[PDB]
Subunit: 95 residues, 4 copies
């Protein structure tokens, strides 16, 4: 399960890495604001402090959202159940 | 399962196609910005770079969201489990 | 199951009705913009064309979101599986 | 199950408490607007009436979202099924 977590963890990193590269290049964001925007996008928070202004950016966001949501929320799912929960359970039993 | 994917795939396309037509016509968006807005709406990202200004638009968005979310997120679910996951698994075994 | 759908359907209506009343009264929205804002809130779309400006409004939105999301998304779930899906299946068999 | 509810209830409170403290301190929000922003963030509503302007804030929001969503939506899940639903069922049987 650490290896089930690891695979999704890597895949999410590669997914955010890619959004960072596209949005910094085509939409002109700083690398930090691209990563931020990528995370705010794929988690469906969506503040809209940053949004794509080019048509190439709008098109890529359509595909990025559809490809990216399933992954991101699977990692989060993994993270909650296989990492956060046991840690919580361990804090209720002094060793 | 390719046919379970195909049905939802088509249904999502028809759903976005329809939002594109309504928002381009009634709210005055370019066809590209209507599709974009439709996708950002039904995935619950919701940047708000575009939002409906007419009452007819606000009313349609209420119904579009309620009818559209279940579909869109079922496709995404299908896509992650029946397309992305196996592809991932295949990349871990050289042929 | 029509009665399982009916209960949630009513409960969602009562939930939106209430947001409409609070936001029209305390935040000063038109009744149509209050309902719209209520729907955009509880589905987690969240355009932000409208947002609460008073502290009483911000506090109520915290509680409304927490109480309202579970309901709204249960109705949508019901709607997709018990209404949309069978209708789809029926359209693939001429009578 | 009251104790399953209680644990998540506490954990959500501690999670919002922490966002309130970070956003009030680093981003300069009033304590009420920090809590509000924290709730609007972790539920993925995301109006964007408030968004982080510092790089330290953007970085923390990335981690807060990933750590916080699984918890918040588990509480909501608990709340809907173990509190709201039975209460609803009880209202359909006069004592
Ligand atoms: K979900
Ligand atoms: K959302
Ligand atoms: K959102
Ligand atoms: K949003
Ligand atoms: K927004
Ligand atoms: K805005």
């Amino acid at each position: 399960k650490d290896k089930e977590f690891q695979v999704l963890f890597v895949l999410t990193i590669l997914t955010l890495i890619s959004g960072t590269i596209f949005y910094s290049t085509v939409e002109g964001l700083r690398p930090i604001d691209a990563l931020y925007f990528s995370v705010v996008t794929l988690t469906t928070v969506g503040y809209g402090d940053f949004s794509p202004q080019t048509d190439f950016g709008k098109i890529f966001t359509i595909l990025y959202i559809f490809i990216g949501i399933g992954l991101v929320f699977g990692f989060i799912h993994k993270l909650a159940v296989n990492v956060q929960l046991p840690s919580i359970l361990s804090n209720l039993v002094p060793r």
